[PDB]
Design an enzyme around this catalytic site. Structure first.
Site: not given
Lengths: 458, 458, 458, 459
Positions: D113, D153
């Site tokens: 991430k 995201d």
């Protein structure tokens, strides 16, 4: 079928003719193949450059890098930022940079590039935003061992900065990718003094030759034009070398020395200081020290050449065509035996022939010996070499160490002319060879002999 | 199981047997493990080369680059084009080149490459296309920070050029990737004078150690056989140091100085010209200045050694096997204290043994001191270093600098061999150390120790 | 939200402070934006390191390279293997390395790196395996032009070699990728002497400025404490320059001179001999030459400062907090004019304070002048630059050349302080500028301006 | 060692070690305990200063992060979040979790991430663009279609992925699947906007079939959805296509509930969607038809829907993180809810999961509430990411049905894997539904550490 590239076609044509007007193709007919191969560029990259103004609107420009020749070194030559800029123009300037670089003796190739982005009116932010976009694509095709750009019209210290900074950001490398950088981040000492000093060292190598090591700048009187980098610093060198600076000038009039003497290093710095604040020489004659009427005579509207009287050396360093045919002859009657251009194309073609025929007609050190810009003024180029040299060691030389080396590099440039004219336009027994004719050919011959060693032609 | 590589196996033995016959393995028995590891190559590229002959036919040859060891530096060693070439041969010459490069003290590794391509009867056109193809593959595995080739048998200026150009073409970089390069595209000044001068410089450091710096070449008489570029330039450097060059030779015969005196520099040059003209010494003695019977004496079919009388130095620089057992003893009868191979393997095993059994028998400057090829004539190898140094900053040195530095490097070569004999083959007190032993081990130890430091073995 | 980084946060706050106590933000309030931008690292690599122990168990440790700022060069700075290591501590040290590095003048950026790997009680085989695993990833983000790491706590010569060798195998390149290298595989001469000489030279440049160039070390009485290499090599250099080493001292006591006379090199080599054998100064006073009570005088318990009578120069070079406030006052009353650090945090804050408030109160050469460790012991850093410089040409310098150059780097370092102090902490007329304040700002301004040149902020 | 406090991460680590311990795994395979210490340190984390320029032309600074956690199964996969709370701690946490989630899809996809603490709040498109340009200029070094393939995201949507994509292509000079969530004409995949929502319902519908021995499905089922973005939209629609009723949606301002027994309709869901485009709220759309109609709807301010829907069969939290607590868990138990899986990332707090997993132990059969975890159940959006890469590499653009068919398969096998993994290792009593939480965590961990062991990461 080619497109129209009239700026390049002429530069091509000026070379061809000087090679033909010489013994080069009798003694080596096969060098017509060199001319044919060399004058197609190895590589040209063109790229869109998209950048954003202070208002946020999109703006489009054309970016180029002509990378002409790399046989004698990595591609080396300026970046130009100006709305005229196009391929034809950058070839014309790339092409010539091959041979002007080659003439110095350093291991440098030849190219030129830039964009048609117009920096006039743009803010520093707009410039920075454009530089960042320019380098985002250009970073791909350059490097300290592949292509080393530099400054030119509309690209100086500031833009060289933005470009270096973004190269780094993308490439993750500190190296000599650009020259004319800031002194703290890989710039070189003796850069501002490079073209001024380089001219003087060149003429010094002429004197010793003509006078068999017996004479020098010492004792000599030296008339100079201009008052910027170039004149200031060529003036300071004459002085340190025990010679006499007897004239400076700006575009409005001449300041000359009355009788015997010279400018001092104190006085030249005053003239600099007023050239920083952009005030003209007529404005400082009313005060001390230039108010001394026994030392200085200010003549208005005038170039210095006719007013200096007896002179030994002549150094145009102000603009182009600042020596006419009538000023060339007066210089000859005044006993001036040496002449070099601090300024590009400083002497008119009329004046050039006048110096060359006089040389032709006077054997040895009775002649007036002339040096074209492309050799004598290459101190700017030479010191770029030394920037990269130091950048390679990641280390700063002293101002003494760069200076000394700069001179040696003007000797190689001097030697390359002297030896190439003796070989391809042999003068008569007694006569000095043609440093102009030598210097238009030597660049081509070093590069073509290189290209043949390397199988670029055969 | 392993393949047969007699050339390599033979050279691997000789080093083992040098090393075993010494104290090296009683102090450091673990250095046996270095031996096991060093003599397996770091890397080897073999490759096909398809190339076009002048008739339009497919030709096939074998390409090789043995990159043996890179602990002290990047791979350094030549390219050879001869039909004999194969992995074993290259593995032989590359293995040797690790230790003989290491011996200089420059930061150089060890390698060798080349091809079974045979330049005999090949047009320069066929050579160029082979060179272009051979480089097309070789360029992937080499580069200035990685692997730097040069000349050897079948590869000189011509091929070093074609190889450089094609490397440039693919890699788009100008750099010190090959050595023996041209003068205008990155060769070093002193390139031709490098083997001759280096031998003379090696000897100078022998003289200083052996007399505590009470002697030099100043006042000494030097016997020199050979009369090509090595002999020439060793004779010149001798004369520059105040030394007397009392002999020169070629295959057919000898030209000696009569009584006392020396060859001058303009006499070497005249010889050098007639050598370029491919005529022999016997044919110039009909004329001046060699017809002077007071100064010169031609001797047909002789080597110089018995006919020079009392002599101080001897410089074998013609062929292999030009000093026999008898000639060593005559030089020892004639007081010669220093003998050093400018030529390769110049002394026969008996002359070497004679000289070694004379050193062991004579403490101090009483002894004749022999210095072997790998130590005395690594000046071509040392200027390869100085070529690379310069290439990096893209800046030529002077003759005076390259030259100064060569002596320095020959000092290091000398020290490495000298000190390694004090430590690992210790002569009795007052007796000089062995330069043959010293120099066959110094290589190994520097690399092995460096290899350990780097975790190549533990 | 940002993580708790106490050691970095304090080091930021100290700079922000010393920048506020100056005219910098008055004269250039934009440079606050530099302090912001600069103080977030350009890049950080964190990486899992998995490595095997002598028993054959999988062990895990963290590895870090903070590449903080690259404006003045490629990233430069040490690696540390200590169980305290986290990003915060390396961020701290990297931050300060950027400014410490800029002080020298050299083209070095700033970084730090390492791992929480614990060397204490690990076998030499485990260290090696972790180095290999560690460097397998780190190799990807360093190089001779990007980042040149070095040693710190837990990383010496041995570790350095292990790091170098794995970089060689992966990258297949011999380059100046690390510093602190073994002398056979890219080391430099004057490494051991770096800090000691470096100190002395910085004090020589101080003297020169503070006596308009008439005094040097010639004639001067020089107080040294310590007797490790740093005091020893500072003491040899003082004597080389015609000065008098009147004290050396171990943690147990102090050896001084009686009246005139000074330590001789040979006596320093006996202190060096017996400091290798881990023996103390009190032990060797039994024997000659030290037992001569006329020349020497051992004082148990004490430091040199109160016992050396009248003195000119004071070089603490033993261990931290070794000059108190009160010993500063005694150094002042003894006539000390010059005081540098060779040992980090040599002077206590009270003694720094006494020295500055003495300088402020005494125009010119009447002042004691205090030079701070960051500028005075930048010798090991300087020679790091010189080591690289040498690795860029594959050609090592002589002791004398690296020595001459270490001097000039120490000049630049002095200049940068002095000039910054003259600029941003102007002293009253006749009073010397603060080199402590000098060296605190000069780092930031040099890096801040270059970041603006290169468009890293605007 | 000094170690920084990364609370969110450390907790997710410890809890995994727990669920793996609380099972027959480390008895049968005691060596997997070594993977524990290795997996939990990241392979590589790249941090970097991001410098950019606002519309007034003033310099701005921000922190750039990419956490490259594990790559045994594939290239590093996982989104970019631009939010002012972003740091290494959080990104390590979201990173770690992304590893096993990507392992459960059965595509060769690793874990990681990244993001920045740049807040897009209040900022012009010209600022975001200029941010993405400077962001990607550094990130482009450490990513690539066979190395690291980021995605959307919070803070990074289709807008930001375009900006980032285009700056990659400029510097690197390759057009490739170096990202996902791309637009349909430049490498995008059909079903990407549908994928998470579709994915959870698909997953849950296998929970029904299993728990009801084939008897029931979404036909008849009242299903309480939270949120009103893309996940809840297409989750809802998938329930309406499969014969269910949707009795709630919500935003941060309130919940919009059904009266009596009807459902939301596609018509209504489409309007709620176009409202959410302008980013207007559910309180701004109940004062004219068809949401005025108070016989079908009741708008509730400040409330989550759960208590207000009354009796529900399925519960589909798709609003935001930590939206369900013990209080609400018990509310759903009391509502007759039997199936719960998150659409949104990490919708249920640990208390909910302890409650739901205590409830499951206690009551045999169809009386248990059964909870499916995030890594297993809301992997539909991330499964389709893998198929986006598949399609970039194939150099083709597959139909809605083909992708759907593949998404379907992916969630089937994931359910099977979780169910069959617990059955083998955390074996339930008779009748009792096997743990999807403990099963999904093992099945992924094993797949990861097993692939890591083979690759010499641990031994």
């Amino acid at each position: 079928n080619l497109p129209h590239e009239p700026e390049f076609e002429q530069a091509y044509k000026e070379l061809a003719s000087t090679l033909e007007n010489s013994t080069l193709f009798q003694k080596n007919p096969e060098y017509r193949k060199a001319l044919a191969v060399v004058s197609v560029p190895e590589r040209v990259i063109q790229f869109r450059v998209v950048w954003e103004d202070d208002a946020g609107n999109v703006q489009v420009n054309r970016g180029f890098r002509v990378q002409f020749n790399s046989a004698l070194g990595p591609y080396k030559g300026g970046l130009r930022f100006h709305p005229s800029v196009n391929l034809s123009i950058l070839k014309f300037l790339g092409f010539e940079q091959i041979f002007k670089n080659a003439l110095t003796g350093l291991n440098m190739g030849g190219g030129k590039g830039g964009s048609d982005f117009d920096p006039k009116g743009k803010s520093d932010n707009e410039i920075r935003r454009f530089c960042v976009s320019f380098m985002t694509e250009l970073c791909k095709h350059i490097g300290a061992d592949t292509d080393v750009p530099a400054g030119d019209i509309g690209v100086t210290g500031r833009e060289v900065g933005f470009l270096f900074g973004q190269y780094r950001k993308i490439r993750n490398q500190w190296e000599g990718v650009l020259t004319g950088k800031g002194g703290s981040w890989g710039g070189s000492l003796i850069r501002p003094e490079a073209t001024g000093y380089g001219v003087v060292y060149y003429v010094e190598h002429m004197i010793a030759h003509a006078t068999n090591g017996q004479e020098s700048f010492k004792g000599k009187r030296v008339a100079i034009s201009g008052s910027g980098n170039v004149a200031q610093y060529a003036a300071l060198k004459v002085i340190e070398l025990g010679g006499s600076v007897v004239s400076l000038s700006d575009s409005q009039g001449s300041l000359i020395i009355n009788g015997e003497g010279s400018f001092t290093p104190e006085e030249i710095e005053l003239i600099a200081q007023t050239k920083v604040e952009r005030k003209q020489l007529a404005s400082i004659v009313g005060a001390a020290p230039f108010s001394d009427a026994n030392k200085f005579k200010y003549i208005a509207g005038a170039r210095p050449w006719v007013h200096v009287g007896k002179v030994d050396v002549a150094l145009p360093s102000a603009t182009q065509n600042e020596i006419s045919g009538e000023e060339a002859q007066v210089l000859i009657n005044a006993g001036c035996k040496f002449i070099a251009e601090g300024s590009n194309m400083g002497c008119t073609q009329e004046a050039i022939d006048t110096f060359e025929a006089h040389r032709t007609a006077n054997a040895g050190a009775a002649a007036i010996w002339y040096a074209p810009g492309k050799a004598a003024n290459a101190g700017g180029v030479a010191v770029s070499g030394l920037e990269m040299a130091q950048n390679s060691a990641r280390l700063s030389w002293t101002s003494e160490e760069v200076d000394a080396r700069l001179k040696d590099i003007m000797r190689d440039c001097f030697k390359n002319g002297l030896e190439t004219a003796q070989e391809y336009a042999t003068p008569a027994e007694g006569v000095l060879p043609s440093l102009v004719t030598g210097s238009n050919i030597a660049g081509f011959t070093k590069v073509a002999a290189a290209m043949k060693d390397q199988g670029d032609w055969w």
